[PDB]
Structures are given as C-alpha cells and as structure tokens.
C-alpha cells in the first residue's frame, strides 16, 4: 500500500486562475477517495456517474485533476450541461462526464482587503470551448478597422478581467477553490484501483 498524491492538488498555497487551469495526470496509485468523502470541509461534493460512497470498488486508467478558483455563485457552471460565462469561455465539461466536482470556501487566502487582482477569467471568445480545452491567448480582441498595436482603447477590449476579491463581498462572491476529478477508463490495463 502506497497512497498517491491527492495531497499535492488539495493542499496547495496557490491555485491557478480559471483561464489557465493546471491538469495533473495521476496514475499508478492505490488511491483512497473516502478520505476526501469524509473530510466535512467540502461544500460541494457532487459526483456525476459514479456512486460516491462506493468509489473504492472501481478501477480506472487515468485520474485527471483540474483545479481553479472561481466565485461561489459560478460553481453551478462546473456541472455537465450548464452554461454561462465560465462554462463556455474558461472551463467546459463534457455531457458524458464521469467524475466528481469538489469545491470549498477559500476566503482565508484568496482575498485581500485592498483587493486581490491576481485571479483572472476570460471575458469573451469568438466561439465556445470544446470539452477540456484551455485558451492562453492573452492579446487584443481588435474589433473595428484599425490595429490597436497592443494598447487598450476604443476598439481594443483586452479579454482578461480580474476578479476583485475582498473579505466583504457576500458569500457567493467569495473565492471558492474548485478541484474537479475526471476519471477515465480507456482500453488499457487499470492502475488506480484502491
């Protein structure tokens, strides 16, 4: 028995913002998801295709783990089928998703009383996002008829706005650290069993 690093993705001093989440491919485990299930600090533990009380009696191939920071009122858009300004331009889950979306309140760290402008989120895009696709294209949208040449102005519209985080916003505008496991069973031997 050797447990496998759920402690590197759940215990981190800095999650990346939602326009560039960090994917951590976890493989060759004997994992324990019931430690996650019986922690009593997660405000949203919703599994979407596996029975969560019986997570140890299954073997997958690769257990991916995305992680980002969004507002509390926008963790409804980290469900399969729901859309919005996060689920289509920042992080899009498929409709045949088989995983568990985990989140908790994180107002201790990600909020500073003058503002914490380090977390960004994408504002618009030319189209929507296919499932599990990130877009680090931080450049001027350039509407109109003139090239902006890298400034912001009348027809430029820089597409990354900052989360203005404070300890006084409301419970729904406080930062919720989301981590979404994505189980996968492709045609291969199975390693992550439990």
């Amino acid at each position, epitope marked *: 028995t050797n447990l496998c690093p759920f402690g590197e993705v759940f215990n981190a001093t800095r999650f990346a913002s939602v326009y560039a989440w960090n994917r951590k491919r976890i493989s060759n485990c004997v994992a324990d998801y019931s430690v996650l299930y019986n922690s009593a600090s997660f*405000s949203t533990f919703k599994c979407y295709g596996v029975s969560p009380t019986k997570l140890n009696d299954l073997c997958f191939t690769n257990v991916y783990a995305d992680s980002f920071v969004i507002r509390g*009122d926008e963790v409804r858009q980290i469900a399969p089928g729901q859309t919005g300004k996060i689920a289509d331009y920042n992080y899009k889950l498929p409709d045949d998703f088989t995983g568990c979306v985990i989140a908790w*309140n994180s107002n201790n760290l990600d909020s500073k009383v003058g503002g914490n402008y380090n977390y960004l989120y994408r504002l618009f895009r030319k189209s929507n996002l296919k499932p599990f696709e990130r877009d680090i294209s931080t450049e001027i949208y350039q509407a109109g008829s003139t090239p902006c040449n890298g400034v912001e102005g009348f027809n430029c519209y820089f597409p990354l706005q900052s989360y203005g985080f404070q*300890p006084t916003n*409301g*419970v*729904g*505008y406080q930062p919720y650290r989301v981590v979404v496991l994505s189980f996968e069973l492709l045609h291969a031997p199975a390693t992550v069993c439990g």
Partner: antibody
Amino acid sequence: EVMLVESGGGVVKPGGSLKLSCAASGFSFSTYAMSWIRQTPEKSLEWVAAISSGGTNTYYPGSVKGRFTISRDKAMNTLYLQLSSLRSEDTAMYYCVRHSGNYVDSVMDYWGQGTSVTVSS
Amino acid sequence: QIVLTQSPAIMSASLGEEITLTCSVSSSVSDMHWYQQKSGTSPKVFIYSTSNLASGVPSRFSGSGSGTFYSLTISSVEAEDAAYYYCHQWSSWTFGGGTKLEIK
C-alpha cells in the same frame, strides 16, 4: 410542523452584550444550514450571521465582523447568536431563519418570529 | 459590490390589473429569490430560483428573468396581496429595497 421561536432579546446599554437563542423543533435539525437576519426600523433586511449544516463554516458581513459569534447546538436543539460590543445602529428585530439545503447557498424556507433588541440607556 | 435596487418603492394597482415588480442587480448573479413581508409578521418565501413557486402560494405569482434583471409579475392582483416584496440572492449581504404594493 416546523416551528422557530426566539429568546434573549430586550434592552441593553451601548457597549453591553446579549445572547439570542432560537429553539428549532419539527425537523431533523443537523442537516439544514441556518442563519440570523435583522431588520432595522426603516424595514430593510440584511444578514448578520450564517452557519453551514455541519457547523464548520460561519460567515459574517463586514459591519459586524468579530463581535457577532454564531454557534450551533445539537443536544438542546437550538441556535445561538452572541452579540457583544453593541452600537446604537444595532437596534433591529432579529429573525432566526432556515435555509433549504446543507449550505448557505439555498433559499430561506421558514422564518422565525423575531425578537426586538433595542440598544439605548 | 452587489446592490439590489428595486424601483419604485411604492407601486399601486387596482384589482383586475397585471402589475410587475423588478429587481435590478449590479453585476451578474445566477438566480434570485423573492420574499413577502406583511404588515406585522415575519417574511415568507414566494419564489425561489426565479421561477419556482413555493409551497402553498397562489398560482398567480409568476416571475422570470436571468442575468442582472429579475422580475415578479402578478397576473390578477386582488385585495389580499398588499405587502412588501424583498428580493435577495446568495451574493449580496443585504436584501432589496422593498417594493410596497398597495390596492387602489
């Protein structure tokens, strides 16, 4: 059915203290998040405290941070809100409210009766 | 941050008319609940998640809307519905202004 009655409210002097208690009876208690809600005599509601279902997360707004301590009781089936270092703008009527789910993101289903906490003299 | 403004604070309709009550939000929220406080009781819940009707409410109250503009429309207002109406969402720390409804 679900009934919510309060206690403790009365007259305090500015700088004093008080402890309201909300007896809840009629449902399985420890799986619903509850909150307290005050009402200034201009009739404009706001939150003052909110606890989750398991009692591990409490949230207070910026005006009453540090001096309002909400707490849950599972044995006597009540809910406490301890007021301390009260100002003159804390004259209100304090409702003891219950959400729908196991967190503070749900809708406030059943409200209490509301006791009056006047701060003067 | 979030300001929940309802305009105006006093709206009046005679019995037989359709009246609508709006609740504007500053930035984008997902849903919005609607309460009613009469003259001398605690507030009760009427509409949750902007379209669902609560337990034991009449089938005349009907609200809809998403984004930064939520509404509550009463189809045929009678003399019973004369009370304050507050809108509140999870991310506010404060309720609406309170739209009073009076008969004519």
